[PDB]
Amino acid sequence: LRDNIQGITKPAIRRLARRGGVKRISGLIYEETRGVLKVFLENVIRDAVTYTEHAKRKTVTAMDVVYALKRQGRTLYGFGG
Amino acid sequence: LRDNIQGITKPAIRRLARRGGVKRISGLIYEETRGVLKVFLENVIRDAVTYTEHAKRKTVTAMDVVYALKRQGRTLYGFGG
Amino acid sequence: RSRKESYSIYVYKVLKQVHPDTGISSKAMGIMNSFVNDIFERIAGEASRLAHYNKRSTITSREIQTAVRLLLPGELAKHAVSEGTKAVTKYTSA
Amino acid sequence: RSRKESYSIYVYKVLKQVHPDTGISSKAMGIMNSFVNDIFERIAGEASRLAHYNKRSTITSREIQTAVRLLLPGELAKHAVSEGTKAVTKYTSA
Amino acid sequence: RAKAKTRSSRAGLQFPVGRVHRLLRKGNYSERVGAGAPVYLAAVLEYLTAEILELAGNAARDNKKTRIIPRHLQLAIRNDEELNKLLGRVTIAQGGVLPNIQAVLLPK
Amino acid sequence: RSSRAGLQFPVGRVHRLLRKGNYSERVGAGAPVYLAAVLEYLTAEILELAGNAARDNKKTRIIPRHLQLAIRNDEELNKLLGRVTIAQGGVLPNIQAVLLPK
Amino acid sequence: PLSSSVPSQKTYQGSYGFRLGFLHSGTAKSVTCTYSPALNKMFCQLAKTCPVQLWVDSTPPPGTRVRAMAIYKQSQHMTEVVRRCPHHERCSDSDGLAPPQHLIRVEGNLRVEYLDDRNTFRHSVVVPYEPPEVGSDCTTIHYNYMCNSSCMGGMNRRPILTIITLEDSSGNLLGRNSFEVRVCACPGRDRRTEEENLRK
Amino acid sequence: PLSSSVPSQKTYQGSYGFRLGFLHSGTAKSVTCTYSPALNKMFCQLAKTCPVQLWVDSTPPPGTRVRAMAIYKQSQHMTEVVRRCPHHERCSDSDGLAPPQHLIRVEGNLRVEYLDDRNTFRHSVVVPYEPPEVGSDCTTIHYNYMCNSSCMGGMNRRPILTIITLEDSSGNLLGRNSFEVRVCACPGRDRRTEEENLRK
Amino acid sequence: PLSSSVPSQKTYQGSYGFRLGFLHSGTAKSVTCTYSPALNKMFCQLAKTCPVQLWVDSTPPPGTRVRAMAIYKQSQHMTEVVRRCPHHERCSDSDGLAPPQHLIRVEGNLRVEYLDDRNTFRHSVVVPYEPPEVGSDCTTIHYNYMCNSSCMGGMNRRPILTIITLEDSSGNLLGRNSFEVRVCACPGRDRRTEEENLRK
Amino acid sequence: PLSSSVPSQKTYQGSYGFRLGFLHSGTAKSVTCTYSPALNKMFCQLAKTCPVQLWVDSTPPPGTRVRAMAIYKQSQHMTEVVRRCPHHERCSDSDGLAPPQHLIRVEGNLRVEYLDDRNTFRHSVVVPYEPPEVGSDCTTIHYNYMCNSSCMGGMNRRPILTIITLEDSSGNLLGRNSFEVRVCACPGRDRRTEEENLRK
Amino acid sequence: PHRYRPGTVALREIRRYQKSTELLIRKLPFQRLVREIAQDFKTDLRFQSSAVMALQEACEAYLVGLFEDTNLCAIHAKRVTIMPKDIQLARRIRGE
Amino acid sequence: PHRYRPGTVALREIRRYQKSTELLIRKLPFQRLVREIAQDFKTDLRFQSSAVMALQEACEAYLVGLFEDTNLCAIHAKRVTIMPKDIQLARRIRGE
DNA sequence: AACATGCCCGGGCATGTCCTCAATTGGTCGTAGACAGCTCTAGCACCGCTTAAACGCACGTACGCGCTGTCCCCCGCGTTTTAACCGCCAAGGGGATTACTCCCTAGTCTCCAGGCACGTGTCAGATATATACATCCTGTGA
DNA sequence: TCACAGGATGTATATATCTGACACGTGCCTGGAGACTAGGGAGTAATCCCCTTGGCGGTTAAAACGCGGGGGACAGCGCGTACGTGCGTTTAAGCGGTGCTAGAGCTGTCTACGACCAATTGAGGACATGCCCGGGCATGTT
């Protein structure tokens, strides 16, 4: 797999910001958002995978994602926990 | 006693902003700072006293303050703990 | 069959005592379970640290009553403290 | 009379391995005791949750190795894991 | 043999006092757990559960629903200033957000 | 004893602490060995950087100020200790470029 | 008793680049021998093994010998002969080679010779010099010190210097070094204290 | 060496009502001699004056003599002969009346005698008895102790009992008493320490 | 040297009601002799006039004599003979009647005798008794003390008691008293200091 | 007694560049020995070690000697022989080498010789000269002074000069120096007092 | 024709996207981004749909909460438009 | 006379106070403020000097840390001077 | 009366040994994990059709950025006042430690209900689709 | 800038179908409760030491207040680019099965590991015991 960071579309970045109450945009936001998103998502994946390897599994479950988020101060409700 | 918030003096507030690298400080900062500091102290002291009451002591120790700080997301080294 | 404990039942009895003509979606239910587990881990964890700090073996109503005041805002703490007091007071009286 | 637990002996010893000529103030020794007790509580607390989550009965070098990799930044993790691996390897042979 | 009465029934609670006594006394929290401790905590959990469900049921009627959905839990938790501290870092699935639009963005 | 693993940090104090603290019922004997190696390694990293910081200030002795500087001059330790306050630590001499005279 | 002369203590590396070295022992309890580079001082327990290394820049000839002698560090005491205290002089701890009264012994070497010098009344212990074994940069001699520095009627809390001389088959000088010695119950504690006082 | 026997310490007032007494000295850190009734124990500096009072219910016959002897208080060591350590044995501190090796001396009295017992190997010092002055109630003998209790090769920190015996012209036992003795550099500090440890 | 015995010091007024008295001198800095009833003690300068009054209830028989002798107040020193120190012993200050080494002299009395006792080695000075003169209830003898209490090799800061005895023609005892003596450079200062310490 | 002559006190460095030196000791109240360059004076306790350094520009011949002698500083007293006081002369403190009456001794040195001059009655102590090691600039002789300056019948508070002379094996004068000496109980207190009087 | 004034659609969209609850990123694009990241740490890793939805909702929540703080930083600078400087400032203030 | 054109001292104070470690608040008044607050929760409380030391260091670190973020908000508004609204923003971004 | 000068006890430090606690060593007993096997669910991959979203381009206005001006606010410096800081002392309270006594919790064994899982149907709810009405936004007119 | 008309979007109302939830029933599987016994923990009281709180005095620092000038902040105006909105076209996703394998989850059996208990030695700090110098008094000269 390559370049799926471009799968995070410009309108999708619009809609996320619109939910956040954002009214008007500079085109620099799209590339900066993708970098910030990649860093947050990578940090969660790395913890989730680490739980998965500890349990000696091949498959990441929601509980692994839940614990990976939770420790960063991000308690997630609705996927088990 | 009473009226010790006035004991958080103006040049001392200046010095704390000098560590924060602040080049110029507006006159309204000193009261805003006092109110913010008072909220912080109230939250720390209330938790510390709750630890001291639980142990049935009358004397707040460094450990009581250290635990009260720790749970507010702020760990303090060098005072025991 | 293998069994997993969930709070869906008691969550869907508490609602019937508050809004008898309403129900809960499976996802809202799942949220109320993670909320219970979270608050449970928080209170149990703090009651554990209180016993540890005081170098003492037993968790009691006191360690929980102190953990509650530490974790909840003051308005919620007083009401939760009231209910916890009444439950233990009745349980020991009955 | 009373006696206390601290790491001052070992902090003093480690300092002599990195800078044999250098002393340490009691205030700095105090910081070092907090640092050790903090990192310990984090690793012990995290290893405890790994064991709880997998419903295993014991903390091993595996739970500690994983909690370290979860708590430390990547570079510190590599070296910490290498030292823990050597320690267990040597201890097993000794 | 006396016929069984559950500790939940004895305390007048709905939450399961035995499960809570298990979750406290085993699973690495404590050296010992006294019998009043599970009762106290079941009441506490029951109270906070009832508060969230009371507020969420109102948000459901405000939407002419009879079924509580994740949106209604989010609305209850953010509208209540105290719940918004207790759960201030929690993320809720399909929660949505409050209709907060900053005044400087409005037309004039 | 500590000389078995070659560590300066006391394994059995760690072993006893892991038996209490309610972390677990039980322990594998490699666990305190592994953890002692980690706490000692991290202790060495801080004290080595702190001794260099003392030498930069031309002092023969480490004081809390020298720990504060040493921790922040390594961004890994700065992330590990991002929410820690140091007694008599002071702060970094950082001045934002927009403030300097021009 | 007193002596007719004072031995020379001056450091002299000579034609062979003669120097001394010591082991990297710790400062823990029950430690037998530990050396301080900062103080040029050895701390050891009574009768225990005290390793001293001999270092050279080139190898001395065969028939070279190594001699150890103790003198009091303070100039007014220098003419008194350092010896064991009367209690340890009487106790039955001789190894069959060392005289009862000598403060310094060498262990593990059958070519050892103990001299009570006819002209100076000084005690000294002598062994042949040997070049390092294969894989070594230095030659190690194991000394034993047979009284605590605090022994009354012996060293009586006065510090001593051990003088080491490299010399030919006639005793002519080839090289010389010296170090201070404290023989005490807790070498670790005392070494730490004296090293810590150096920063005060 | 070891003795063939252990002297009896058992108090025996006899036909004359023989008993001991001691002075009311203070507890100043470095006081010369002081005594504790609570411990039945004397604390004194080496070679300093140690006054012991002799009390009787009736006056013994002329030719009666008073003897002092030392034994170790701990049962394990009772068979060893209490004597000066090898250092103080060699020092030139004899007064022209006492042998070099005896632990106890009497000062002031020209008629003193010292015995090394051929049968038991024990050491003891003896003087003629003398009655009090008219209006006085006791006779004072002044002893000196010639080694600290801590001396290595001698007492070696082991506590001792001084045994006092009233005897006829031939050495026959007329009466007997005993007290514990510590010979030390700071009798007041040590006496207070032991008296405080009596409450613990 | 040491004496074979100790003189008696017990007060004994006897058949004649014997006792001692002293002048009401002040405590000024230039005073040569002064006495303290509170301490039973005389303070005086070396070689200066020291009046001692003799009091009686009835007049002793003709041929009665008065003797003065010095002994050390502390019991361990009582067997040592009180005498002048080696310096004042060698100096040329004799009056033609007193031997060089005697501590106490009597001035103004040609009938004086000085005794170095062949059996006890004690020094003493003796004069005939004479009844009081017109206007006095007592007879005054003028003593001189020939070393300071502090003199090294002599009294060496040890306090002394002057013993006065009233005696018959054979030297048998008719009465006895005693007083403490300090021979010093500033009697008024010293008397005031010791009387002030009596409230501390 | 009085001498027939007064020794020359004039400084003379001679062919070997002879000079004296002294240690940089402070003025702690009871320091054992301390020297003042401003007064050219040594302050020291009785019988304690007094290190005097000997400085030369070139090494004197073998058989060279160093002599010490004492004279009174005041011209009224220069003809009197400086000696110990009659007390310290009688006391038994001879070290097996020094006569009882000599004021100055040398400690530690076995080759010392003591002279009571038949023609001048002056006391003096002599030792052979010894050179330092090739990187050390001076040789230390350790004198002892066996009476306080304040001893009555001896120095009697009169100041003294110590004269040091270098000599050949026949006694011919190779060099000479001198310094004032005060023998006292608190050398630091006294040195500070006399140096403070140098501003009064 | 009609045409809106530049900048007025936003207030409807703000209300709509604040009021509705569905996910704002499409499933397949996000799923592949997760796999593209994770392969860098371990090949052949495999995934539960619940896990991927869990990751997505955390990412949308993180970005939405970031965008609100970013918006306030822009308002504080009295701007109408958000910029990378606003993103950078908010993140730095939170210690990220 | 001579007097400073302003701000060079301010940069020197920044250098000096960033270099030093000691308390910048007064030693005694803060201790009375702790008592004034604490008595609201319970009377007759007693205070270890180490406990008050811990409160001071925590409050200074909090305030200094707050002043760093306040400084950045001000730079973002392109101002030289900090303002109450800078403090309110940083706090609000930080979830207070 | 002020200074000259010696001597003894105290504070503190110097230096050898003891007591308490952990490690080491060894043995015994039970539980958990490891290892192996089996069964089913979920995941992954593939294909087709339909719609939505996304992407690119075109056209216009709003916002951003820069520049300029005026006033207010803060800094800098000096002087005066107030409290802090430092040093030392006194008394009481609280905390800590030790010993003893009773209650509470844990552990063990046995029986019944509670909870959970699975299945079915209905109702309700929600979702999806269509129509009508109201509100908001933009342009036109003065 | 203010009021009215037209266009577009949102909200409200009505109808039909499917799924989810709820309810009910049945069955199954521990889990919880009930009862009894044993050991430790916690609670209470007494004693001892350290720390905190409170008080007093002196000296300097810090804080507070005032005045003058400069810099910054805030407001206003102008010009250009960027972004927004709309339209058309293209691409991918979403939705809905179809097919196969790997892993996940669970169960069974045996070995090792960990815990628990007892006896012997070393680590670590506290205590045991002696010498120096300083403080200050004791004693003499001018």
mmCIF file of N, CA and C in Angstrom, chain I residues 117-148:
data_model
loop_
_atom_site.group_PDB
_atom_site.id
_atom_site.type_symbol
_atom_site.label_atom_id
_atom_site.label_comp_id
_atom_site.label_asym_id
_atom_site.label_seq_id
_atom_site.Cartn_x
_atom_site.Cartn_y
_atom_site.Cartn_z
ATOM 1 N N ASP I 117 60.723 14.380 111.327
ATOM 2 C CA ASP I 117 60.507 13.205 112.174
ATOM 3 C C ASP I 117 61.175 11.959 111.596
ATOM 4 N N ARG I 118 62.038 11.329 112.403
ATOM 5 C CA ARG I 118 62.819 10.182 111.945
ATOM 6 C C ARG I 118 61.952 8.966 111.626
ATOM 7 N N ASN I 119 60.762 8.868 112.221
ATOM 8 C CA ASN I 119 59.909 7.699 112.028
ATOM 9 C C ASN I 119 58.858 7.899 110.938
ATOM 10 N N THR I 120 58.299 9.107 110.815
ATOM 11 C CA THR I 120 57.233 9.384 109.856
ATOM 12 C C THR I 120 57.664 10.264 108.689
ATOM 13 N N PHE I 121 58.846 10.877 108.754
ATOM 14 C CA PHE I 121 59.374 11.798 107.747
ATOM 15 C C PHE I 121 58.583 13.107 107.645
ATOM 16 N N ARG I 122 57.724 13.408 108.623
ATOM 17 C CA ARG I 122 56.898 14.614 108.581
ATOM 18 C C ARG I 122 57.664 15.834 109.089
ATOM 19 N N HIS I 123 57.441 16.979 108.441
ATOM 20 C CA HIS I 123 57.966 18.257 108.915
ATOM 21 C C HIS I 123 56.956 18.916 109.852
ATOM 22 N N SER I 124 57.440 19.474 110.965
ATOM 23 C CA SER I 124 56.588 20.262 111.854
ATOM 24 C C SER I 124 57.420 21.297 112.605
ATOM 25 N N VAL I 125 56.744 22.357 113.059
ATOM 26 C CA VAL I 125 57.353 23.452 113.811
ATOM 27 C C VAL I 125 56.648 23.578 115.161
ATOM 28 N N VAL I 126 57.426 23.812 116.229
ATOM 29 C CA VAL I 126 56.929 23.771 117.607
ATOM 30 C C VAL I 126 57.414 24.993 118.387
ATOM 31 N N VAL I 127 56.554 25.520 119.259
ATOM 32 C CA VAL I 127 56.888 26.613 120.179
ATOM 33 C C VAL I 127 56.241 26.353 121.535
ATOM 34 N N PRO I 128 56.785 26.946 122.605
ATOM 35 C CA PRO I 128 56.124 26.843 123.917
ATOM 36 C C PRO I 128 54.802 27.599 123.940
ATOM 37 N N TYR I 129 53.854 27.097 124.733
ATOM 38 C CA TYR I 129 52.619 27.837 124.963
ATOM 39 C C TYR I 129 52.839 28.917 126.019
ATOM 40 N N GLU I 130 52.209 30.076 125.810
ATOM 41 C CA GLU I 130 52.211 31.180 126.758
ATOM 42 C C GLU I 130 50.809 31.774 126.850
ATOM 43 N N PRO I 131 50.362 32.162 128.045
ATOM 44 C CA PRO I 131 48.967 32.626 128.219
ATOM 45 C C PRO I 131 48.754 34.011 127.627
ATOM 46 N N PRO I 132 47.493 34.408 127.409
ATOM 47 C CA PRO I 132 47.208 35.689 126.738
ATOM 48 C C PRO I 132 47.724 36.912 127.493
ATOM 49 N N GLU I 133 47.935 37.998 126.743
ATOM 50 C CA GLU I 133 48.444 39.256 127.281
ATOM 51 C C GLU I 133 47.297 40.168 127.733
ATOM 52 N N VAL I 134 47.672 41.300 128.341
ATOM 53 C CA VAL I 134 46.699 42.265 128.856
ATOM 54 C C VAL I 134 45.837 42.784 127.710
ATOM 55 N N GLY I 135 44.525 42.583 127.817
ATOM 56 C CA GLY I 135 43.594 43.051 126.811
ATOM 57 C C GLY I 135 43.192 42.040 125.757
ATOM 58 N N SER I 136 43.632 40.786 125.869
ATOM 59 C CA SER I 136 43.266 39.731 124.933
ATOM 60 C C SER I 136 42.791 38.492 125.681
ATOM 61 N N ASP I 137 41.824 37.795 125.082
ATOM 62 C CA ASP I 137 41.360 36.499 125.563
ATOM 63 C C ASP I 137 42.120 35.329 124.935
ATOM 64 N N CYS I 138 43.125 35.599 124.097
ATOM 65 C CA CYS I 138 43.763 34.581 123.271
ATOM 66 C C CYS I 138 45.241 34.907 123.058
ATOM 67 N N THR I 139 46.017 33.876 122.712
ATOM 68 C CA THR I 139 47.446 33.998 122.424
ATOM 69 C C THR I 139 47.667 33.873 120.919
ATOM 70 N N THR I 140 48.392 34.827 120.332
ATOM 71 C CA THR I 140 48.586 34.876 118.884
ATOM 72 C C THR I 140 49.975 34.380 118.496
ATOM 73 N N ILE I 141 50.019 33.433 117.557
ATOM 74 C CA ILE I 141 51.258 32.941 116.960
ATOM 75 C C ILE I 141 51.307 33.424 115.515
ATOM 76 N N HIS I 142 52.470 33.927 115.092
ATOM 77 C CA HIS I 142 52.661 34.458 113.740
ATOM 78 C C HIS I 142 53.399 33.426 112.890
ATOM 79 N N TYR I 143 52.670 32.776 111.988
ATOM 80 C CA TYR I 143 53.247 31.817 111.058
ATOM 81 C C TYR I 143 53.625 32.497 109.741
ATOM 82 N N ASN I 144 54.560 31.871 109.021
ATOM 83 C CA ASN I 144 54.879 32.210 107.639
ATOM 84 C C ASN I 144 54.833 30.930 106.812
ATOM 85 N N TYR I 145 54.202 30.988 105.639
ATOM 86 C CA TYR I 145 54.133 29.853 104.723
ATOM 87 C C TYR I 145 55.041 30.119 103.527
ATOM 88 N N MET I 146 55.922 29.162 103.222
ATOM 89 C CA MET I 146 57.087 29.410 102.376
ATOM 90 C C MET I 146 56.993 28.791 100.980
ATOM 91 N N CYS I 147 55.789 28.445 100.525
ATOM 92 C CA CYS I 147 55.525 28.113 99.130
ATOM 93 C C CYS I 147 54.055 28.383 98.843
ATOM 94 N N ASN I 148 53.767 28.832 97.621
ATOM 95 C CA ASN I 148 52.381 28.954 97.188
ATOM 96 C C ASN I 148 51.775 27.562 97.018
#
